[PDB]
């Protein structure tokens, strides 16, 4: 009783844990009460309990600071009890740890400890380690003497001492600046999947020895460089406690024949000797490239050596081999057969949310000025990966140091703590770094959960509802589909003029469903045909299977028919290699994988009819140019972010813009916004967008869809009855 499993916390605070209400009732505590946590080796910690809607009933959520103090790791179990007899302290003595007090001097108490404890009312216990961040340094402290015992709350009227040499870290505790899970920004879902696969085989080997189940013995990670493939593998080893062994392709390959095989074998033998252990092989495609793509005996030999070592993992107890590559299909297929590397995780590229998380992680210690907006940075840093975002944070920090601190400090190794903490990093320093950095992953496809909601789409009221019926109902009400023997559709095709919201429709349903949106464009289908590389079709559908829940959006479905001539072409049909492979993958995709396929085309009259047969994109929705009421709705929606003057007549504009698409109505509103901003800035060298700004915007806006294009779409829609 009163025993919970240790997990990660959303709340970063050094004295807070989160419980689900049913365990708050079992412990007979209320929100805000102080509890005592009992871990391992007679080590305890004191904290405040709160609650949220994310913690499960069986688990207790805490940060790294509490886990280190309790000498526990993720997956362990501790005791929790209330302690309503906790009172305020009187005198405490807190000293820093030597591991962090390097290159820094001055009054550490006034810079770190006093802001940390003053009016903070934090529960402490003798021996508690806690981390105080600031001045671009992370300094951890230990409580070495308290008058009350063994715990107390530090009130603002208590006396805090800090005199003496820094404390040498004990072997029973780890540094809080070591790499852990809280250092990983985007790809949180991928990290969760790895945790489920790895934490138990290593943290609780007794479970797999006693229970008739097999552990994973190899996980392949892939994605562009700089996304965190090596960070995840190391963070997992650090969190679970397994010994981390580092291997990389090019180093092993740089060795002479016989040396490369011996070194690879030694790493596996050492992992067993130090089990539990993780073997991370970087650039797997370099150490073990496809045998059918090489020529020499030595290159095939090292592949055979790795393949047999992977099979040997059935004898090497508690050893998991992880690997990283850039492309999952650049390694010998034998490595991915049952056993060996039978699991893999697609890391990819972080999206706008993940990039913001990475920027926040690499600014933990940085003092930011009020003008700094990391969300704006994350939106501008398209094509950047964690390696680039980390560089941006460090570069912004350095610029702040050179502007201020170099006019205060000596050209030496040691800096006063007060001068460091007095420095703030401004938005100009981040923007400067953005001008110096260049994205390392700008061409690769990025898969993200979109932020588009239904309120972002003007008009199309029935189409929005139709998508919910097609996408949500098959899983929200599965008993009705079974009851009536109805087979849910696997996808829908949209047709009509460009710029009417086809993309928003697919994103909006992905948003509400919390699903990944995968954007596939015509140029990809065109390249596959001409380059005889239709194998990339499998990669597209495989990514959707791995990204599930997701919406797989195939734009420009007409590109295949156009590649065969489109308007002229030969005398045959639209069937070809690429569409045949796409249709095959569609037929082999089950609705039980939570993957929905949406297509779009601006030339529906030339789409291979095969894709419209039952089991494919059998549903057809026409998306015309917005009508009178829809155009007003579009103009209004685009202005929700800015004040609009009462003299602005949006219905008049909608009446004039009869031939405009939603994309063209957006330019009108956005241009009027820019014009109002221009005037506002000039007035200080205004509070709302005036009628003059919309009338001026109309001087530049034009319709993108001609009358002849409209008739083509209407005639097709009429043909379908």
């Amino acid at each position: 009783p009163n025993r919970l499993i240790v997990d990660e916390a959303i709340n970063e605070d050094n004295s807070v844990v989160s419980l689900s209400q049913p365990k708050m009732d079992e412990l007979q505590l209320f929100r805000g009460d102080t509890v005592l946590l009992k871990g391992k080796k007679r080590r305890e910690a004191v904290c405040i309990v709160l609650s949220d809607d994310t913690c499960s009933d069986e688990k207790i959520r805490m940060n790294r600071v509490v886990r280190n103090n309790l000498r526990v790791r993720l997956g362990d179990v501790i005791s929790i009890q209330p302690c309503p007899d906790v009172k305020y302290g009187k005198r405490i003595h807190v000293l820093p740890i030597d591991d962090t007090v390097e290159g820094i001097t001055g009054n550490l108490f006034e810079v770190y400890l006093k802001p940390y404890f003053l009016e903070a009312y934090r529960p402490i216990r003798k021996g508690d380690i806690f981390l105080v961040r600031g001045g671009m340094r992370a300094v951890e402290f230990k409580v070495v003497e308290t008058d009350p015992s063994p715990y107390c709350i530090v009130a603002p009227d208590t006396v805090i001492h800090c005199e003496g040499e820094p404390i040498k870290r004990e072997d029973e505790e780890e540094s809080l600046n070591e790499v852990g899970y809280d250092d990983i920004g985007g790809c949180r879902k991928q990290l969760a999947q790895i945790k489920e696969m790895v934490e138990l085989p290593l943290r609780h080997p007794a479970l797999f020895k006693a229970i008739g189940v097999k552990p994973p013995r190899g996980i392949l990670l892939y994605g562009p460089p700089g996304t965190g493939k090596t960070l995840i593998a190391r963070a997992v080893a650090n969190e679970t406690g397994a010994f981390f062994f580092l291997i990389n392709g090019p180093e092993i390959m740089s060795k002479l024949a016989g040396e490369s095989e011996s070194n690879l074998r030694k790493a596996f033998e050492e992992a067993e000797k130090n089990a539990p252990a993780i073997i991370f092989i970087d650039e797997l495609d370099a150490i073990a490239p496809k045998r059918e793509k090489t020529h020499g005996e030595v290159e095939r030999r090292i592949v055979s050596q790795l393949l047999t070592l992977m099979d040997g993992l059935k004898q090497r107890a508690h050893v998991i081999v992880m690997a990283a590559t850039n492309r999952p299909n650049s390694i010998d297929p034998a490595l991915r057969r049952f056993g060996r590397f039978d699991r893999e995780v697609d890391i990819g590229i972080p999206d706008a949310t993940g990039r913001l998380e990475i920027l926040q992680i690499h600014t933990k210690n940085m003092k930011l000025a009020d003008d700094v907006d990391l969300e704006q940075v994350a939106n501008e840093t398209h094509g950047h990966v964690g390696a680039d975002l980390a560089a941006l944070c460090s570069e912004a920090a350095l610029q702040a140091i050179r502007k201020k601190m170099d006019l205060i400090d000596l050209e030496d190794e040691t800096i006063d703590a007060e001068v460091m903490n007095s420095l703030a990093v401004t938005m100009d320093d981040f923007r400067w770094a953005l001008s110096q950095s260049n994205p390392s992953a700008l061409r690769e496809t990025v898969v993200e959960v979109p932020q588009v909601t239904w309120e972002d789409i003007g008009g199309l009221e029935d189409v929005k509802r139709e998508l919910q019926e097609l996408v949500q109902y098959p899983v929200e009400h599965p008993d009705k589909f079974l009851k009536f023997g109805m087979t849910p559709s696997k996808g829908v095709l949209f047709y009509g003029p460009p710029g009417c919201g086809k993309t928003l429709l697919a994103k909006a349903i992905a948003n509400e469903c919390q699903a990944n949106f995968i954007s596939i464009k015509g140029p990809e289908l065109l390249t596959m045909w001409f380059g005889e590389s239709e194998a990339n079709v499998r990669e597209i559908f495989d990514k959707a299977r791995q990204a599930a829940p997701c919406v797989l959006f195939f734009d420009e479905l007409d590109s295949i028919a156009k590649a065969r001539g489109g308007n002229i072409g030969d005398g045959g049909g639209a069937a070809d290699r690429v569409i045949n492979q796409i249709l095959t993958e569609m037929d082999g995709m089950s609705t039980k994988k939570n993957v929905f396929i949406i297509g779009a085309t601006n030339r529906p009259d030339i789409i291979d009819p095969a894709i419209l047969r039952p089991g494919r994109l059998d549903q057809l929705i026409y998306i015309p140019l917005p009508d009178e009421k829809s155009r007003v709705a579009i103009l209004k929606a685009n202005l929700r972010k800015s004040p609009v003057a009462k003299d602005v007549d949006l219905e008049f504009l909608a009446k004039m813009t009869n031939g405009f698409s939603g994309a063209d109505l957006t330019e009108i509103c956005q241009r009027a916004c820019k014009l109002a901003i221009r005037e506002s800035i000039e007035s200080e060298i205004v509070p709302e967008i005036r009628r003059d700004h919309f009338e001026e915007a109309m001087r530049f806006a034009r319709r993108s869809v001609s009358d002849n294009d409209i008739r083509k779409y209407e005639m097709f829609a009429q043909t379908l009855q």
């Binding site: 009460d33 405040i48 709160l50 305020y88 009016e119 009312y121």
Partner: peptide, 20 residues
């Protein structure tokens, strides 16, 4: 008890100011 609820009020203020 009361000292624990005052400790919770301080922890909630720190978490809300940083996360909001």
């Amino acid at each position: 008890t009361n000292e624990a609820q005052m400790a919770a009020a301080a922890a909630l203020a720190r978490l809300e100011q940083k996360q909001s």
